[PDB]
Amino acid sequence: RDSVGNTVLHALVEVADNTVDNTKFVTSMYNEILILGAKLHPTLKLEEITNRKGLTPLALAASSGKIGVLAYILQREIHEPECRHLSRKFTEWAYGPVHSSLYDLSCIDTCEKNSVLEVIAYSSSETPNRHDMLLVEPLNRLLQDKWDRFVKRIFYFNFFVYCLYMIIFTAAAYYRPVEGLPPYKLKNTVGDYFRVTGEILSVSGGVYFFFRGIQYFLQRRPSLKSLFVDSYSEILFFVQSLFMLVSVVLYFSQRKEYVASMVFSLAMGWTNMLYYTRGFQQMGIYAVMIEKMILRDLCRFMFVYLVFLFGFSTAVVTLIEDSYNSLYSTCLELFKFTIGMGDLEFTENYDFKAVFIILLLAYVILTYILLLNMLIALMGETVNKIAQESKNIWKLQRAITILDTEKSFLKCMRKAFRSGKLLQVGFTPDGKDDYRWCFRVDEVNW
Amino acid sequence: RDSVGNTVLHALVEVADNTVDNTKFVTSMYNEILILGAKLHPTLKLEEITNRKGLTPLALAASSGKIGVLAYILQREIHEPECRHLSRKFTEWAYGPVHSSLYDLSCIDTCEKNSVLEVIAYSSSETPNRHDMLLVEPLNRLLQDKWDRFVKRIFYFNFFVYCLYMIIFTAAAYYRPVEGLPPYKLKNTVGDYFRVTGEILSVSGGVYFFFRGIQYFLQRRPSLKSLFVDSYSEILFFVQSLFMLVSVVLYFSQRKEYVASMVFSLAMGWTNMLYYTRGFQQMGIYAVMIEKMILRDLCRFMFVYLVFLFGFSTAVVTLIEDSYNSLYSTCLELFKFTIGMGDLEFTENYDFKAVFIILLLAYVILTYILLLNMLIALMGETVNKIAQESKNIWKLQRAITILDTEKSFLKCMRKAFRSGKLLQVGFTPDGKDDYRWCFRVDEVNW
Amino acid sequence: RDSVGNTVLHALVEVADNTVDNTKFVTSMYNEILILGAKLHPTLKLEEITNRKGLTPLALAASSGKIGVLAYILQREIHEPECRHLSRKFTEWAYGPVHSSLYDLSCIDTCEKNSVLEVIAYSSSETPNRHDMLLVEPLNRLLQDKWDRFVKRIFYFNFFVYCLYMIIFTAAAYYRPVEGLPPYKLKNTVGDYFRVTGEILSVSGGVYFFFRGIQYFLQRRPSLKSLFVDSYSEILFFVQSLFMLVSVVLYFSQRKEYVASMVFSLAMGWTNMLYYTRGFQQMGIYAVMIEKMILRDLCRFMFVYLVFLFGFSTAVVTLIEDSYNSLYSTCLELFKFTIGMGDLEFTENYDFKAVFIILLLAYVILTYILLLNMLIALMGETVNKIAQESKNIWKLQRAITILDTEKSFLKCMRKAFRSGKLLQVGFTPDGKDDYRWCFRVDEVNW
Amino acid sequence: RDSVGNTVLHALVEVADNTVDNTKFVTSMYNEILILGAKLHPTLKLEEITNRKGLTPLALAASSGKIGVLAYILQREIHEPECRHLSRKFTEWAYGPVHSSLYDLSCIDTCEKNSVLEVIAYSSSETPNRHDMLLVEPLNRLLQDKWDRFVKRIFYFNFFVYCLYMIIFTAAAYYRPVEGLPPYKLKNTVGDYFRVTGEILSVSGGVYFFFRGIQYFLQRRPSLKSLFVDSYSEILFFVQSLFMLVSVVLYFSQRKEYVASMVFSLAMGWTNMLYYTRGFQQMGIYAVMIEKMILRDLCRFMFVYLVFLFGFSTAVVTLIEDSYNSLYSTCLELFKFTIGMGDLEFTENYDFKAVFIILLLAYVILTYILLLNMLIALMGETVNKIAQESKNIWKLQRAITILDTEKSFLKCMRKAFRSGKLLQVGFTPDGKDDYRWCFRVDEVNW
Amino acid sequence: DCAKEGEVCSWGKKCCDLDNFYCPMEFIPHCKKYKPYVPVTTNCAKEGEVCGWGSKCCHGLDCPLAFIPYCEKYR
Amino acid sequence: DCAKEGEVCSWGKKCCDLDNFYCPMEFIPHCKKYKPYVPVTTNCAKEGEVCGWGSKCCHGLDCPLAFIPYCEKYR
Ligand SMILES: C=C(C)[C@]12C[C@@H](C)[C@@]34O[C@](Cc5ccccc5)(O[C@@H]1[C@@H]3C=C(COC(=O)Cc1ccc(O)c(OC)c1)C[C@]1(O)C(=O)C(C)=C[C@@H]41)O2
Ligand SMILES: C=C(C)[C@]12C[C@@H](C)[C@@]34O[C@](Cc5ccccc5)(O[C@@H]1[C@@H]3C=C(COC(=O)Cc1ccc(O)c(OC)c1)C[C@]1(O)C(=O)C(C)=C[C@@H]41)O2
Ligand code: NA
Ligand code: NA
Ligand code: NA
Known part of the structure; x- marks a missing residue:
């Protein structure tokens, strides 16, 4: 019996929970069942089962993080006659500590529906072991070789182009004209032509980023609940694009406020450069730490601090009546007290001075010594919590970066395949030959 | 032999110390003894034995934290013909990994003397497993379902009402009249009517909290030694009520000092809003951390710091004689030095200046670098100590919140029972049927 | 063969290294040797061997930290007919979990040469288990009962007397006359009589502390190498006494500089009050942590910081030539920069300003961010290191406090013994009776 | 078969990976191979085979970190008749726990190509066991004796001389003449002669350090990739020499800017005195924590901080147009904000003030609270990382310090050999006697 | 040119005559005249x-x- | 009484005529007169x-x- 046409292998992928004994259970069942199916009806491929979502059992295993299934289903190796057309791994050369294994490469690069990499790297950040799933030998070495071969030429080139764009934007912004009421009529001097060119390039960059963000949001379809947990970088780039467009709209509307928009874009224009530090072995950690601290910490501490700030602010402002002249100024003053920059003068001529002093001393003790250092202790725990995972984290930062680039590929090339339509495998119940884009990989393990 | 009429089960509850083999021994003795009692005199219930404190073996096991006993006595399960009327756990449907067990829930909701929940949640903060004892399946799931069913609507409603009350109080306080000598005669303008309404609502809230606090203190009877270790929240709310009442008393006494009281109440009126953050899965920890740090840490560090401050303060004040013009001002100045806000000017015209400098440098080195960072290390230790246990603490903080509300409930209905006078158990030595308010719970465990 | 007349038991104390199997070895050797000695020459006691240091095997085991030997030799329990006079432990009543043992307490309080307490508590801070050696039952119970019985009334009384002395000293110092050229002629007003009385009491206290310190130094005879590692408190009290005496000497010398001495004494007069917080279960930690940090940390960090301070100070002072007018002022300014209190103004009219700025920025980065937080990390390590173990240290803080007081006791009674010349032991190869100052202790252990 | 004429022992050293069973395998192979070689061709020594790098199997094992091979090959002990000339360890006196072993010492001090000391202590900080490999007994005792015997008399003396030099230099700096346009004509007063003498001594020191640094760089040949990982101290001393030489060159060129060079040298002249702090058991650690923290931390954090600084700096400078009058001043102001020294004044007359405030508050929150404390937590992790390894670390500091000094020896001394051409070993396949400079060492181990 | 009394200052404009008018810090700065x-x-x-x-x-x-x-x- | 020019000030005494003399911060304050x-x-x-x-x-x-x-x- 089944629910939606699921095969027994499908139900077993669902049931498996990465326990060692359950792993052996499902592994042995898969071995026997696949052998029997190969012998009974060697007429068509059955692993590409359709479904309501079109999900294969290996695709489901990738989606749910059932690493135990992936460890075996992608590593079948057998030579028993009448069932030799379902093997995925082979061997050609062998030595004591080193073996030159031959791996099948289908369902990874070009499956046309949902490859293995296309699900592990695009998971919803609930899978407990997505950082380890890419450590399996075929995927790990494929990503390593794709990185070494051609990807770097595109990544470093992108980084250089972005840096040039930001330098040009900064230069154009610095030299804006001072007289009021835009738009301004250019003179025939060379400086005006350079400034106009800089502005045009800046707006072009802004428009480009806007459309890239639109495409990403339409294709990915975020949930609106995990919108900010993932896809942080696209959100920030898109926000920059919005600010730039608002700035140009105000510019052509004959208002002076466009500068107030522009500088905000300019600030992010530099800051988002930290994105490109992902993918470096060492310097990448200082990006992910900022992301975690700024999302999953301060959105909680915000309310706890704000209660204290607002309560004491209204207390002080209503106590003194006749520099604390308004609610805003007092909010700023107490904020300055919080971070140790403020000063306690105690000038004359306030009535109720003796109570004012007690309130301020209570506030300073409560906020500066007690609460703030509590926040610091929590952040210290957060950063120490991911000192050790840094290697595996970096691997994810590598992998996703590749998958966006090779998907885009920018030159109408088709060099993604590793090597060959190798016919040396050629196993099939028919008399014909076949290939699987096989990859020779040396494993040194003893 | 016995001390105060205690049964053998009672003495075994006393003796039990939560060791695994002692648990096995006591449980086996309970099984044999209860079966013997059912065989000998199946005429009346003996589990509800009275005592000088009126504690049943269940009640005593709950009070003393004998978790190993509660693991058993609340989950008795046996098939002994003619003696099946003392079982608590049953089964109706059963599958491989999942079983739909049927749990007896009598004496938990309406025992009329002292329920199990009324002891675990109201313990004196010496029981070591009070945060874990509520994790047993019957109680745990009962509380979960009671929360999900109806309690949330009351809790969020309470939170909203309190927030409105505080907003109204702040608005009324901000717009107080400026001219002196209260009470003030209202004008026929609308603003005066709104202000009077705000004041009336504020005083009503103050009176209400006063009476709620008095009722709690009369019902609970704290020891006066653990008065502040538990019941922190009622103490703070009551303090607010006292300040509000003092304020109104001064207001009608034709004194303008009432504002000095009112603002203090206003400050607390915001701050203890943090109480309602308890019960949230994540944001609740920032309340209990503050409670622990402010009680069990600074009441010890206070002595050391005060000794240093007072000693150096008197030294400086007696050294210079002829701004440090008095003991109070110098105490404030050295306090400012402690938290890095002060400044070292070294003006002219002090005699013995060369000694004054040495004293100040010794003080700064002793307090700012050495002592304060020691305090910070201890608070960091405290914060990391309860990063993990907070989850279980949150469960406790959930449970107590329910028990106050459900017991009160303020609508005189009786919808708190889970379901049914279920007769499917119906076990008794007589020919009659019976019910125990049983609850069907699916356990998924394999 | 032997070195200095040492017995075989003595050599076994020397050889024992607290290993479990060596403990069994020396234990069995002691059992057999003691039995043989009892059988061979039951004529005189042989345990009180003389030596060059006058150490018995018990005394040497206590001195060297051979806890394994103390674990047995103080609790010998055996029934060997005709040789029952070597047992130290006996029994009168016995139950399942609780036994009312009878412990020999001789040679612990009045041995007249060197008791176990008199070397365990007076060790040179190299003994590895001195914090645990007092946990052997006879010693632990002696100290606990002596504390509960009478010692507290003396300790709290001492604390109160000292507090009164310091209050009187502060009051006398505050109201010193302002006119110059001491000594000053008193007037017949009451205030002068009170001031003179206060001064006389203060000087008397100073003299008393001076003589107590001298007596301690003569009796203890410290090494001059571990002078400051132990005996910190006597050193500080003695320093106070010296400052007070110098102050009075200057006072009668017709010089007005005496105040410069007096205030220093006054400062320590308060600070040393922290000594009396030792012996409290909770608040005692804040004394030992300060002692350890101020001795075994800053005497190392001092030189490393001073190199930076002096180097940059001379660099800045020689760079600018024509507020940094002298070496002293510049040293102070850079010190202010170290602890975040200073300010970077960069005024005009210095030549070489562009290099001055680079030097200061290098200094601020090197000292404030980098070095100081290194020091803070080390102190955090120290504080967390002894957060736990110092519970055992509190026991030491108890024990030494008793041993100084009971030794003096200031009432010329001899009520320190626990109870009785109990004759119920009465074991001897002769026909006579005897007592060992035995005490009955209930041990509950199962 | 072989690659480059390597012996079987060479291949075994290469293959060994410090596993226990691989250690046993290689050990037994060495035992059998050595016995066979002694029996087959007792005509010449074959263990000391050269290679392209000139590395013997002992030398290669030392170079590659094959500690397991050093554990055996340095301590061969065997009684094989007719083949006893391959033993390195012997015995003369023996007792129960203590044995007076006799160790061969050849090829450690005078091998004339590449001693074990010359590669174990000169590793590239990639060897995994370099901190432990010198803990093998013969090397450890050699270094301990060399330290105690004669080496100290040099090292302390060296330290004193350096300190004296710096003092003179400081004086020579302080009293420079004030009038402009060097060089200055001396007067016949004594002060001028002292100043000229001081200057001459200072320049001589600078030249000496320059040539020592050049000699080191030519002899060592650093890779230019690990140039700064090792050889930090020579780099700093050489930099000092360069600054001094530039200073004197400008001095004779009739320019006033020489002082701008000189003070920089003066600063380092003090600062790097911490090099001599290495070699102390306790005070040495405070040097190493600097060396890592300034190299392997801030060269990473630099770019992350600079992005924020530059972005916000340009944003603020372009927002306000008409003290923030230039990019440099604004960069300084925001830097002052980073370390809590600055002030938020909010003066009048800036247009767009409402946006200026928001930018500054965002910057303060982003840098001061969030980023900086992240840096501090990472440094805390680094500091605690090497609190424990200090005992090993200082040993390395000892060893290298000896090897540079004794090799240099500075006085034509030849005291490095322990004692004697001891003939008591005298084992050889010939009928002759022989010596191995053996060392008698008492080992106490049971 | 500057803003006049009652107009919003400090978002794109400052108010004139600092000896007569000032731009307060209230997040919506309506500049006002001084008082004796x-x-x-x-x-x-x-x-x-x-x-x-x-x-x-x-x-x-x-x-x-x-x-x-x-x-x-x-x- | 105050100290005179050249005497050690600030250890037990200040110097007179602050408009003429000042006590420098050098840890041994010899009091000195101003300069034009x-x-x-x-x-x-x-x-x-x-x-x-x-x-x-x-x-x-x-x-x-x-x-x-x-x-x-x-x-
Ligand atoms: C997520 C949003 C919408 C965000 C947008 C603005 C307002 C932002 O402040 C925050 C909230 C904030 C508020 C106050 C202080 C700091 C941060 O975080 C980002 C946003 C956060 C930052 C700081 O975050 C970064 O370090 C950028 C970054 C780090 C790591 C990345 O992988 C990354 O991906 C591209 C980007 C840059 C700002 O855009 C900026 O330059 C200013 C002035 C404010 C920052 O809001
Ligand atoms: C490595 C190089 C070339 C170095 C040379 C100069 C510029 C240096 O700053 C650094 C970088 C720097 C920049 C800003 C602030 C701090 C450090 O580190 C050293 C260099 C680093 C230091 C500080 O490092 C030390 O503590 C010295 C030291 C520690 C341990 C050692 O074993 C040691 O070996 C001799 C030397 C001293 C300076 O030379 C100095 O006195 C000033 C003003 C700057 C320091 O550059
Ligand atoms: Na600060
Ligand atoms: Na920390
Ligand atoms: Na300041």
């Missing part, structure tokens, strides 16, 4: 009375800093 | 010249804050 410094009115405390707890002292004397201040004429 | 404010002498840099790296500018012009300053007429 009126002298102290009645109900100020006199010499020897407790100051700072319910009322300030008159302009002729100062209120010192202490837990329970008493005003004294400056000398 | 002499004007700027020669060798000061002029407008357009680099200032702050080897010489200051004359009293009639100012030296801005930047990595390579150039002096300008004070306005």
